[model samples]
Target: MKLSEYGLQLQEKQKLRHMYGVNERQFRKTFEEAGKMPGKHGENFMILLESRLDNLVYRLGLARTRRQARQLVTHGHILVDGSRVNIPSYRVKPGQTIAVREKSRNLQVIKEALEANNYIPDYLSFDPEKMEGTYTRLPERSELPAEINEALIVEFYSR
Candidate 1:
């Protein structure tokens, strides 16, 4: 399906994609991967999309949104396994801990995120006292929130 048909032209697609820390090929590849999977592909697709590093950070209340989370990760404000990693696409494992750099703790954007008690997913448990979050386990599709019509995406890729 053409992006334009979905109210997103090529440029609009690219802009939204970059806003989410994904390149065209990488984003497309995810679509392909999710489509190739068995079972209800729609649920799986949602899981894959929601599991993105930037989105996870935002869900943890470490950043305001996917864009802010990606910026924080790209600028070295985020740390994984107690070491600095500036790549926003880093795939975190279940046991790993993600935290904001000490200096970034005072950042207004981050402070806002921390201050807000937005809904937190059950898959993750955060300790405000420690200011760190852990990915207890890969979350089930039902637990992910984007509310995207994943079935349509699956059918689009199946074409």
Candidate 2:
């Protein structure tokens, strides 16, 4: 038995959506925004998703999972550029700093997640002493740490 190309593409789309923890509506909004951006739609689409606050929090090793990261953000445990941002989908920009609130830095979940994490992407820098990180720049598609078939997702949505 073999899956059709459309089936495979849809699967790719769903896989990417689940990985980012976005629902269909939010995913479509991101896709539409990416299409309007000045870059290859596939790369721009993924860059936008990767630029999400919760994703960056997870990437910074502040949380073991994206869901956990989102929870931390919503609960006001995270700060961006010294201000509290509770929206999980907040798009982080280059040069911005993300940090755990001083009060939250000692959280067991955060400490354990940091201990378990060993990989951090080049486009971001972290400092364990401060329990904070900086988004260096908007990453190219190749620079993103996740292995996603962005082309397939574009095709799936374009269809």
Candidate 3:
């Protein structure tokens, strides 16, 4: 089926929204936040999405999927800098430590995720022995693996 420009743009936006597991309201709010930041809107948007606590946790292999990571965060199984943060959308910054609570460390899901050969990007690091990981730096656009046509997403919102 042939798609109009708008249809293509909408699909791209939805794909990104679904990939990040955020509802429309949350995604729109994040898009606005990205616009306010000083940089390429698409890259800023991607960085903001990637910096979310659940996304980072998923990347660290503490959870097998982003949905599972969000559950762990919202259920209080995850901690940031030693304090329990239940918000899955919390944005992590460089040098912050994300850890599984001592009581939650023995969870089979977490254990299995940790054991899997997860492909973590350069911006994050994990230590299986400590059941923790660090956000080392912000991810660059080129380093991000998602082949999202971010420009289309930005244009879609611009309209």
* RMSD to true structure for each model, in Å: 4.7, 2.0, 1.7
Report the number of backbone clashes for model 2: 0
Candidate 3 per-residue lDDT, tens place, 68-148, comes to 788899988887888899987677778788889999998888888887645778878887888888777789866664578
Cα lDDT listed for each candidate: 0.70, 0.82, 0.81
The best candidate in terms of lDDT: 2
Off by more than 4 A, model 3: none
* Residue 80, model 1, lDDT: 79
> How do all the candidates rank in terms of lDDT, highest first?
2, 3, 1
Model 1 lDDT per residue over 3-114, tens place = 5555432444445455556666767876667667676766655556666767777888888877678888888877777878787655676787788889888888888988
Worst 10 residues of 1 by lDDT: 145-154
Give me the displacement of residue 156 in model 2, in angstroms. 4.3
TM-score per candidate: 0.72, 0.88, 0.90
- What is the lDDT, from 0 to 100, of the residue 30 in candidate 1? 65
Q: lDDT value for candidate 1?
A: 0.70
- By TM-score, the candidates rank as 3, 2, 1
